[PDB]
Design a protein around this ligand. Structure first.
Ligand SMILES: CN[C@@H]1[C@@H](O)[C@@H](O[C@@H]2[C@@H](O)[C@H](O[C@H]3O[C@H]([C@@H](C)O)[C@@H](O)[C@H](O)[C@H]3N)[C@@H](N)C[C@H]2N)OC[C@]1(C)O
Ligand SMILES: CN[C@@H]1[C@@H](O)[C@@H](O[C@@H]2[C@@H](O)[C@H](O[C@H]3O[C@H]([C@@H](C)O)[C@@H](O)[C@H](O)[C@H]3N)[C@@H](N)C[C@H]2N)OC[C@]1(C)O
Ligand SMILES: CN[C@@H]1[C@@H](O)[C@@H](O[C@@H]2[C@@H](O)[C@H](O[C@H]3O[C@H]([C@@H](C)O)[C@@H](O)[C@H](O)[C@H]3N)[C@@H](N)C[C@H]2N)OC[C@]1(C)O
Lengths: 150, 143, 129
RNA sequence: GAUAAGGGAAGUCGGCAAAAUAGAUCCGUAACUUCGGGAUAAGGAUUGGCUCUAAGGAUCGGUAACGAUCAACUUAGAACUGGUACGGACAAGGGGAAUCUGACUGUCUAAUUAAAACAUAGCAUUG
RNA sequence: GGGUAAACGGCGGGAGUAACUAUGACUCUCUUAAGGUAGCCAAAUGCCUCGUCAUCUAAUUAGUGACGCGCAUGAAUGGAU
RNA sequence: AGGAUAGUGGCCUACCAUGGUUUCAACGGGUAACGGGGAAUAAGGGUUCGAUUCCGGAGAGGGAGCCUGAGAAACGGCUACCACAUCCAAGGAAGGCAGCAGGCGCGCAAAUUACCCAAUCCCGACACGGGGAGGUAGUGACAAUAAAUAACGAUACAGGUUGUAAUUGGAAUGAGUACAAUGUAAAUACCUUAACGAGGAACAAUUGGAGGGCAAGUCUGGUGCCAGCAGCCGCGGUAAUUCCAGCUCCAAAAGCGUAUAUUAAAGUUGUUGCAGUUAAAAAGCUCGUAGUUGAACCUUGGGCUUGGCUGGCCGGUCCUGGACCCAGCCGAGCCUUUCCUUCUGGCCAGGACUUUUACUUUGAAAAAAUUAGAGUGUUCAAAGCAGGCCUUUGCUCGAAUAUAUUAGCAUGGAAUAAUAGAAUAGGACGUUAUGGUUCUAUUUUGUUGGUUUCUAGGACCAUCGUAAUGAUUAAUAGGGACGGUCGGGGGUAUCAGUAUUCAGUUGUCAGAGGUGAAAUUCUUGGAUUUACUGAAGACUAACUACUGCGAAAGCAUUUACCAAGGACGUUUUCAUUAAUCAAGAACGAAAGUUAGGGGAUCGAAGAUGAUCAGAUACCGUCGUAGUCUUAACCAUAAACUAUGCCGACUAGGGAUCGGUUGUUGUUCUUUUAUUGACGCAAUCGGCACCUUACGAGAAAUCAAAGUCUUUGGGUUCUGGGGGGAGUAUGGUCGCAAGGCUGAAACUUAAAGGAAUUGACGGAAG
RNA sequence: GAAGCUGGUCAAACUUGGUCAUUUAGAGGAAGUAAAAGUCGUAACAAGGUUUCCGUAGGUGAACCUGCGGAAGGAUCAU
RNA sequence: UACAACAUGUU
């Protein structure tokens, strides 16, 4: 179920069985890669890039049309974010909640949700340090929180 | 399920959990606190001796009506005062104030017995001779 | 979350058996589940079972013949000496002439009589009778 | 103004008076508490002289982490030494356990009463 | 005629009553503006009085801790800490 | 580095560094703790005991220090001090029973100041001596073995062929005593034995019971809720099967009872294997570290040859086995892209290599005694390890055999569960690919001590040469993004609304108020009642429900802003990031606390009127805190669904809220679209509900409280008869009120749960 | 080569202060429990005659009463 | 409107 609530929703994208591109789709693998690079260079997280590709270029899964996943392609062409986008978005949400809270000191539900969000941030940062994606001594702190999202 | 861990490396939790909950059993708790050594009138002994201080009659509890003859006794080993029942018909006349009696438990390992409230001991011997012998005129009270 | 897929499979099999179902769907599947099901099939307790490929973990549909009383897992997978199998068969099995204690051994997954023939032991896996 | 054997408040309304303590370094420090204190609590050790050693700097000159020139007294350690002395004169808290009472610092009967009296912050009432 | 006590001030008697005795939770009656509440005490406030018990001492009209029908304790005439 | 020691070592010294242990429980405290071999109980798993016949350690009243000696920090050795204790002529001197015996003390609790080196064995200069070590006896109902207290006839009986009766005889004998020998170091005892040794065979069996559990009396007398019994339930009040006795009967018997501890019964400690809705027990609720636990996936199928065992066609049957065949099981070798370290000798014997573990198999080794167990007429048995035969100058089987194993050392397997690898390639193989350097070097000009690269081997540094060059799914786990929504979720401003109270203006006059009924109270100064305006604080009616949101507590007027959220939709993204969680944190109704501000209304306390026997209660009238808000505390509720959380599965139905997906005889825009509402089918998530009883339960009841003796998905917390008691104490938090943590003594036979029948109700029909 | 002497070293023992563990006296005070037929009321069990109970805060001879907010374990599964 | 209580122990 949901990690920080009682919800048990199952609404997820359902990947197709076929691992080959459809016969009606004809775009070069090099073309799809350069499209990925163009979208990243303008500035777009891999989730955003995948959404645009699927919506406007018939690119269902970039994996089946390039043989490799988007974030792996970005790392192979020097476009991997310094902070993984999961952690980046969690820190951004925490910054937004903190800035809301500094005015509304009597909003106790916001304080409770801040605790939950920061718990998720620390668990994810722990995971990333374990797989050496983040430096061994990387640490999220609220005082420098706005920097990494700026 | 079952509320207890089953992991194959959970022996510490299981053993410590059993150790904590064994304190809820009276016999284990008594033998590990050493309450017989520290608070039992006999100090853990099966029998004890003492000097008779006074004869007292104790009203039997409901639905019985009687006077159970007993003696107030001061123990020798620790100076404690206990009440002991003197069991048989007319055996109270065999015991007197200042006599030395041998006491035993009263059958229920520290509890009262029957309709006699607050009495947990019984007289076995007086002046070095058993009451069963005196009651049956098998011996004589020494002097 | 899911901590033993063998446990889910055997529970689903037993529950479908008790309701009179001729067939049970198992999800997900695994090598251990398939080996255990093979041991149960070789003794006739189950019929044909079929593996569906979903490119994720697999599903299994089993043909139940109604000859099975109980299948279950022994969890945790206790270590068993060669001569501690006696107590496990005494405690888990209806009698000394039918039923099986399934062991995973370095010689492979098998039942306890095969383990005695090969003089091998390992960790207990479950039972069937 | 001094000293005094043995005793050590038996003196006396009352330890009045006197004695005892005392500097500095190190150690150690209870109840209670308004958490700020109590506290130098209590209570221990050390301290001379002499001969040494180490540490703490400034200005010049180009891994200068160096060389040169100059300079104030603090601290720490060691050896040696004596009729065991040494804050050697001077200077310099006695301490503890409680009760009554006023919270505290402060103030008054010049010339017999300094206190528990007065004041005080805080609190309340009145126009 | 109404209000007002952090205004001045005030804040009770007499009989009976429990299966040893004793005591009196309980009852009756007289009466007040109200009948001393929370606390505290032989206290710098208690006469009787060197009260009674305990502790302190060889021995204590002293000290301290208790007790309380308190001659005559007691709440900003502030009570208890 | 030294000193010291027999020697290693912070063992000690000097100098230097700042280390060492710990929630996987250090450190500290307690032990009515010497450890083990072992003992009892014992389905299994367990629980409890072990001072004590053997092994190891420590001590000799308490400490410390030593001499001698191979060996002692010795105590039946010394020195000193402390404590005990002895003699004395008063100067002085002598001590160590936790060795044997014995005494005092202590206590519930334990034996002679005996005999002896004969045996076991030890010591010495030793064949000879010594040994309270040891052995022998005394005491000895610790425990254990065997085993008397009677046996048989005939008369009269009797029975239905002897099962049953009193009075009629003869034998049998060991308890006891004692010649004797034997036994022994000498004895004592046993064993053999002469003479004795039984009618009440008085040479006389007891201990507890006789309502139930639990075997055996309603027989007699006594007592009369007394005396007493009674583990428990109970008995006893003038017909007691229960007390005191008599008789009779029962159980076990040289033994039986009592007390205490402990084991089984106890699945009432539960890993196997308990219970937590209501009987005891789910933390108020979320976060969260340690701990425990964690989706799936990587050599699978096939063929040939071949060794051993079981039953059968060959039967070969003397339980023995035979080409081959029917089967089955367990081995071994090659081939399939083929894993097995690499090279040298040429299925052993050498160099250079080696990812770590858990797990399981097999071996060596593992004091006796004890346990199990084979043999064996100790007269049997407990026991012991003896013994048995042709009959003596002798012979002869034996003194087995298993159990030990957590840890360690060897050893096969490679499932299960982990661990590391090639991703900014710093990646693998080039053996016979080339070069540059450098090191170690055999063979050398062998006449002794020199050279440098062709040279042998490491080892670096490049170039190039091969390779299919090298990255598992993305889980109806999780996380993140994106889209349109949906909410009485939160916060801050803002807009309402009537009502209540209080007023100021208007108008009339006798009452108004309140109750089951009154009274206190207000009223001609006009109370109450009517209309208008106004001032205050609260609150958010009606809509409003088996409906919504939130972690819970909770959340309901309008609007705007702030950030947050579930669900849904997704062919977006990461890739195990997860579950539950000691310690540690956020929030937490009401009441309560502090300081300001407000204080309409209700209203603890208080005042007061009634009812009442009394009511310092219910009822009536006031009314202080409080109720509201701001900034801080407090942390508790029947904080309840009295039901932990995550995950999987198991039976039917109709509704409802949110999202999405297909679709009309309907209403609305427009009569027509990309309108809105409504209607009809599918799904995902919710709050719930209905039927049945699969299955569960003691039942009430439960779609979970099911999938639980056919007992095991992961994990946290709690309970162990009722009380004492959530008390005392220590700690800790709080301004306080109090919160959290949290015993014991002692007491007691039930307390309790669900349901049945009845009775009862100031309950209904 | 004896007594004796110097400097060390191990260090008994005593005195004072600290600390930990166990036991223990006490005026008085406040509880708990037990014990045929004593007193006062009647709080609970029926709508127990004011439904009961939980938390919190006052009050009161006593059971207990009252305020605020909860629960049904209600005397209502319902308009 | 008002309605308090019923000594001990059994067979
Ligand atoms: C005073 N009685 C105590 C009672 O308080 C309780 O003690 C527990 C004690 O068992 C707990 O401790 C226990 O549980 C911890 C666990 C938390 O890790 C274990 O580590 C520990 O070994 C275990 N003894 C301790 N943490 C708290 C006490 N109140 O249970 C034991 C007791 C003796 O009955
Ligand atoms: C054992 N024999 C039975 C015995 O059970 C006897 O008991 C009753 C008992 O049930 C009565 O009943 C009692 O039972 C319970 C409980 C103790 O059983 C008591 O708590 C309660 O006072 C009372 N109801 C009590 N008055 C005593 C005997 N008359 O009833 C008759 C009997 C034959 O003597
Ligand atoms: C039920 N509440 C009771 C209250 O009613 C009162 O009860 C007494 C009770 O204790 C008395 O009884 C008591 O005292 C008698 C004797 C010494 O008087 C004893 O024999 C008896 O065992 C004992 N329980 C009884 N005789 C009268 C009741 N009202 O006792 C106090 C109490 C416990 O609160």
């Amino acid at each position: 179920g949901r990690m920080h609530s009682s919800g048990k929703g199952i609404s997820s994208s359902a990947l197709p069985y076929s691992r080959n591109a459809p016969s009606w789709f004809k775009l070069s693998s090099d073309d799809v890669v350069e499209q990925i690079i163009k979208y990243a260079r303008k500035g777009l997280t891999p989730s955003q890039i995948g959404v645009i590709l699927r919506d406007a270029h018939g690119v269902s899964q970039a994996k089946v049309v390039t043989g490799n996943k988007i974030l792996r392609i970005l790392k192979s062409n020097g476009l991997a974010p310094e902070i993984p986008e999961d952690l980046y978005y969690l820190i951004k949400k925490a910054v937004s909640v903190r800035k809301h809270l500094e005015k509304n000191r009597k909003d106790k539900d916001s304080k409770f949700r801040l605790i939950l969000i920061e718990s998720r941030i620390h668990r994810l940062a722990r995971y990333y340090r374990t797989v050496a994606v983040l430096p061994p001594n990387w640490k999220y702190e609220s005082a420098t929180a706005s920097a990494l999202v700026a | 399920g079952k509320g207890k861990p089953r992991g194959l490396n959970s022996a510490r939790k299981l053993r410590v959990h059993r150790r904590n909950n064994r304190w809820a059993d009276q016999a284990y708790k008594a033998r590990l606190l050493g309450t017989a050594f520290k608070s039992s009138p006999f100090g853990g002994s099966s029998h004890a001796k003492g000097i008779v201080l006074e004869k007292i009659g104790i009203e039997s509890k409901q639905p019985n009506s009687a006077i159970r003859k007993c003696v107030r006794v001061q123990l020798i080993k620790n100076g404690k005062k206990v009440t002991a029942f003197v069991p048989n018909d007319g055996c109270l006349n065999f015991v007197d104030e200042n006599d030395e009696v041998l006491l035993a438990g009263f059958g229920r390992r520290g509890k009262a017995k029957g309709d006699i409230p607050g009495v947990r001991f019984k007289v076995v011997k007086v002046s070095g001779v058993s009451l069963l012998a005196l009651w049956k005129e098998k011996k004589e009270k020494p002097r | 979350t899911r901590t033993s897929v063998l446990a889910d499979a055997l529970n689903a099999i037993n529950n479908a058996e008790k309701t009179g179902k001729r067939q049970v769907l198992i999800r997900p599947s695994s090598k251990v589940i398939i080996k255990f099901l093979t041991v149960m099939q070789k003794h006739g307790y189950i019929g044909e079972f079929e593996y569906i490929d979903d490119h994720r973990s697999g599903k299994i549909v089993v043909q139940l013949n109604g000859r099975l009383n109980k299948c279950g897992v022994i969890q945790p997978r206790f270590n068993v000496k060669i001569n501690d199998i006696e107590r496990w068969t005494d405690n888990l099995l209806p009698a000394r002439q039918f039923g099986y204690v399934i062991l995973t051994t370095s010689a492979g997954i098998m039942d306890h009589e095969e383990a005695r023939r090969k003089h091998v032991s390992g960790k207990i896996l479950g039972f069937v009778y």
